[PDB]
Amino acid sequence: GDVEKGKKIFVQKCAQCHTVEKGGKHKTGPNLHGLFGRKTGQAPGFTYTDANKNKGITWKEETLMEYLENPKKYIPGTKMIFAGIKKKTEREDLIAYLKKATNE
Numbered sequence: 001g002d003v004e005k006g007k008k009i010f011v012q013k014c015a016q017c018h019t020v021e022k023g024g025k026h027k028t029g030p031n032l033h034g035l036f037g038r039k040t041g042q043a044p045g046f047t048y049t050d051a052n053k054n055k056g057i058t059w060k061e062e063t064l065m066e067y068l069e070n071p072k073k074y075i076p077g078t079k080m081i082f083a084g085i086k087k088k089t090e091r092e093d094l095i096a097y098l099k100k101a102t103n104e
């Protein structure tokens with residue numbers, strides 16, 4: 001719950017292939033705008049994978065955590081293989097930033 005350390009983990013983790021900035025520009029990957037609430041593979045832009053287009057679950061706070069600790073195992077098929085998170089606060093914090101970052 002530290003948008004501060006959450007941002008740090010973001011600039012070095014997700015900023016790589018993301019934007020998480022409203023009215024931004026999805027680069028080397030889709031955006032996470034108003035993510036918390038939309039169904040998997042629902043963002044119009046990047047060619048989402050069938051697994052994400054399967055619409056099995058919806059992005060949320062906790063859902064993102066399990067997804068942040070194993071993005072692949074959560075929705076097998078999703079195009080994203082880099083590195084999951086280690087500690088919980090890393091996910092919560094990281095998610096705290098993804099919230100205020102995808103809200104602005």
Ligand code: HEC
Binds near residue numbers: 014017029030031039
């Ligand atoms: C490039 C090596 C990536 C890094 C680093 C991160 N992500 Fe990513 N992410 C990437 C791709 C190519 C995709 C598309 C996969 C697909 O099925 O279309 C994604 C997707 C996501 C999503 C899902 C989008 C949605 O369904 O709304 C999320 C929530 C996401 N990525 C989060 C995320 C976070 C928090 C990262 C930093 C820890 C991160 N990604 C890094 C590619 C890459």
